[PDB]
Design a protein around this nucleic acid. Sequence first.
RNA 1: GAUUAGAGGUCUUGGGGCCGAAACGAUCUCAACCUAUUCUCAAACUUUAAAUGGGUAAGAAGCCCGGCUCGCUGGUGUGG
RNA 2: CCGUGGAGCAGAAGGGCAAAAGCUCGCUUGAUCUUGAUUUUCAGUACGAAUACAGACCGUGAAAGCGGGGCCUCACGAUC
RNA 3: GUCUACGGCCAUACCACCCUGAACGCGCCCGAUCUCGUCUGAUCUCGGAAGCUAAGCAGGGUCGGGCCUGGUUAGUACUUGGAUGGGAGACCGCCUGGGAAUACCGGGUGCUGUAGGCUU
Lengths: 159, 48, 293, 205, 170
Amino acid sequence: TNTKGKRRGTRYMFSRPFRKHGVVPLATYMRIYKKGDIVDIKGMGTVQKGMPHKCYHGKTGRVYNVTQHAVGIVVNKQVKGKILAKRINVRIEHIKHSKSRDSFLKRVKENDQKKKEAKEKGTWVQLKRQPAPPREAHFVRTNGKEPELLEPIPYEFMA
Amino acid sequence: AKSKNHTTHNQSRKWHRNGIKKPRSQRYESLKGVDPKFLRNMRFAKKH
Amino acid sequence: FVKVVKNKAYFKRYQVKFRRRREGKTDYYARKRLVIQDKNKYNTPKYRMIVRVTNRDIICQIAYARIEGDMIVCAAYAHELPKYGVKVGLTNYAAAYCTGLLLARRLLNRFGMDKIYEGQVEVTGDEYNVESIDGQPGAFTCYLDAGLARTTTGNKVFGALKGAVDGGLSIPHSTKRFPGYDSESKEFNAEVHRKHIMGQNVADYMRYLMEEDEDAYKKQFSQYIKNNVTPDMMEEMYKKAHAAIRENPVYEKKPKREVKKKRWNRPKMSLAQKKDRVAQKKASFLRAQERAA
Amino acid sequence: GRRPARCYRYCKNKPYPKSRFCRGVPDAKIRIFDLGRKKAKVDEFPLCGHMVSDEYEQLSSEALEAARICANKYMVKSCGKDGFHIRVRLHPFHVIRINKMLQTGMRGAFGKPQGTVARVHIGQVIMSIRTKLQNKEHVVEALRRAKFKFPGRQKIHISKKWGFTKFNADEFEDMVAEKRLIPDGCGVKYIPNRGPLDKWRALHS
Amino acid sequence: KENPMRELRIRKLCLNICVGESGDRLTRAAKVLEQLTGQTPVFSKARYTVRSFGIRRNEKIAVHCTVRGAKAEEILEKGLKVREYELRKNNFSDTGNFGFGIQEHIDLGIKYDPSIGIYGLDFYVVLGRPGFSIADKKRRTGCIGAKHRISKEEAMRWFQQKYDGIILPG
RNA sequence: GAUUAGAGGUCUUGGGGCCGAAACGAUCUCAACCUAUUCUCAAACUUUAAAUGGGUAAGAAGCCCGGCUCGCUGGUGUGG
RNA sequence: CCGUGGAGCAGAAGGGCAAAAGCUCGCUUGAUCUUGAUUUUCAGUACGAAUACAGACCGUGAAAGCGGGGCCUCACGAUC
RNA sequence: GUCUACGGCCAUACCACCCUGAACGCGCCCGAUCUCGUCUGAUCUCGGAAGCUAAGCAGGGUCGGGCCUGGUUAGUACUUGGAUGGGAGACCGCCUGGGAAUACCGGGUGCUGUAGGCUU
Ligand SMILES: [Mg+2]
Ligand SMILES: [Mg+2]
Ligand SMILES: [Mg+2]
Ligand SMILES: [Mg+2]
Ligand SMILES: [Mg+2]
Ligand SMILES: [Mg+2]
Ligand SMILES: [Mg+2]
Ligand SMILES: [Mg+2]
Ligand SMILES: [Mg+2]
Ligand SMILES: [Mg+2]
Ligand SMILES: [Mg+2]
Ligand SMILES: [Mg+2]
Ligand SMILES: [Mg+2]
Ligand SMILES: [Mg+2]
């Protein structure tokens, strides 16, 4: 059977990208994580302290505790037929703010603003994101040039 | 007397016929596992 | 022969270091431990004091890091000393002390905290640390950024640190790198540190030159003679400089003069130019070779 | 001495090359991969003919050598001793294994190395012949009689390229005259308009 | 014309003696070297272990020292006087430095002491130029450009012009 | 990490010879070497790199205000 | 002089590392005392191993800091 | 137009050679009494200001290498789902969707934050 080591099969997952080894850029250290941010997990092999287990690599969780160097986050893990929301502590290098939430936040601010506006105007405005509707009817103008014929080319071997 | 060693052939069906329920998310989550000194502060603030 | 080391594969696989590391200006290993604030302090600034001794100047700044680039809140330059009285000798230990004190006083004066935390008005050169006064705003705290300088005993970065500490800033330190610490006895000589601060170590050098040689003395201190500074008066002029700094530490920017918009360096030539150049180079070579043949 | 070739015709296992893990591999029988007047320039052997595989399979190294020997024999018989240049374009890198029986049975049934084969894809060249223009039917017949030494199905194709190059013969001469490719050994060097002007001066001088 | 201070100056002179075995011979070689150079030299341990030369790992087998300035040109003058200001084309390196060896030491102005014995040594000189400290200073290190470096021909010209020596072919 | 083939350079060395007392002085060469090319490969190689797929979000437990508590952090009723 | 690591980091291999995690010196014993939480196999039980803290005593450094064993992945043991 | 101190992103910024740098600045540079450290004041530390853009550094150049970004390769390779499709097989064609990577050919060659100067 296999081995139950903590880092089995991570030679590519925890490795560094090509031509990106060396000193960790300081912007990663200079970011602020508060209680309740949605955050992504991406193990970085450069630092070995507080490295998350390989099964949380690429997972997104919620911050619930902030500490000197690390952050505690609640993340869902599918174990057999059930999902457990378990909390793990990850050092700040292996973490990154999720941009999936800021889009929704900006949308909230923007449609709240356009709801506050036009409230006095009384006009109607659409807020829900409708799915891509079918294309409407239109005209395709030929400019006096007729469409050119397309025919299959004859078979002839290359190799 | 050999025998089959390991399989997961029916496991997905077994899990799904009752459904993989997400954890019961709900407001006011517990405060266990939080930094002790920050917790001590929050207790003092609530007290006063 | 021999392999070519700087091979195309070598350049393909080569990974450059950071720009500051390539220029040699920044020690990122030290910067990581120096400018990084604890995560549970959130956006609480972590101030630090940058001291850089140049070939002709002393730079002292107060900075805290930000993602787009660390921001300078206060700065003080050694070449401002002639305004307060120090006309010459802008690099020595005394000048470092005055510029550190000026930076400290400028920060507090910008910052509305002069009447509190006056610090050592009378220079003693001994172990001094400021304590926060209850019912009043807390003392400013920062940490020294020695940079790439070798932190041996008697370094001018530590001189600037002492100057600001006497100014009133609360900077953790120990009296081990100040001039005066004696390794063997492991003791500190506050009087020796004081005379180094006030510049006597140059006064005895000039008197030593007086003892034997004159032309060598002129060669060593030419601008000193031009500015008419004598060994005895250096202590008095440094005291006057300290008094003036503590009196008026505010900085006024020099008025801006309108530019005449003159380009001093060659602009980048365009694709059309650099293509016409090679075209006419080929034409010229062909026309020269057809005759030379 | 060796097992029939039908026992190793299909690409059933992953490529299993000889390396620090697979040790003790016997040497492949084919050692020479080209012969004839290989020390010839590019402008005297314009005609090029390939034998192209039509099946995805694996060809034994020895069968490679046997086909090479047959083609070389017919060529020296027909177009003289040095009027051609052969090139086998398949190197046997995938070693095969054998679990010999002498009674353990199927226990511990991982085979020892036996021989080497080359895995061939659909439409991949097997052998290439370059020669003068007039020996076209000679090339075709040599490749046709070499076909009988291989399993599966193969085709003969007279390439439109010039010799063993990647340039079409109907403007190869024009391009070399214009000095866009410079002949060397048995091939050519492409000269793009990208180097320093010193090389351009050197080859236009 | 010329730049007044792109001129050639010697920046260090290295003396060494490799005896190949530790002991009384080694310390007496150190003594003669320090008497010659006016300063204490240092011992270099063997990098590896080879029994052909009868040496092992980490024992002192050579004594070397370096000098700059006044004493450097005095010692170099003594050495060239011993070598009658005669050098060969191959004595000069591609980087502009050069050097030679003296088979025995008492000729260049050292009194013969029978106890210490006799020792030869190697002289090497590293030709410099104002600004070469950029390559090795700490704060902002950098190269020394292409024009500013020294070549074999410049070293030859400097040697033959400043010390009016002769470069015999070889 | 395997791997075929020819090109151009030199003394950087070796091998057959040759004129040479000898001479990188010289003649061919075979080589190893270097520089551009060229044929064919990798489950325990890789600059690149899919399709299928694995998380997270798509609001009332949300946003926007005003004010209190804190023994924590604090240049600063600062930050949290 | 060139030298992006082609070396070394105890050991297998893989990952990681250049004013360092490598080499050489200086000083030391955070390999120390103590309650909890969490991860890894998992039944989501132990052992083992590991991760963030917190409370004392310290070490080191000018200091920021770093350190409660070994750069990480293994080197170990219930009841009576 | 540009520099210095501290930086962010870390080659569009690197590497090789060549040309030009007004002012400030950064440097090279001159010495070792004191502080400090070496075999050596070479490095480090300290005290200065005779000379110089030679070098570093900055700007520019190269039908430059590299790097970055496009086109081609290519709807090719591969691939989700489907068939009582073909074929002795090996494999291949079609339907429904997604869709690469070399060679080869183009373009570009650092942006920018805070504080402080010079261009009076
Ligand atoms: Mg059975
Ligand atoms: Mg069973
Ligand atoms: Mg340091
Ligand atoms: Mg049979
Ligand atoms: Mg199989
Ligand atoms: Mg270190
Ligand atoms: Mg503790
Ligand atoms: Mg260690
Ligand atoms: Mg000096
Ligand atoms: Mg310059
Ligand atoms: Mg110049
Ligand atoms: Mg280019
Ligand atoms: Mg700027
Ligand atoms: Mg004017």
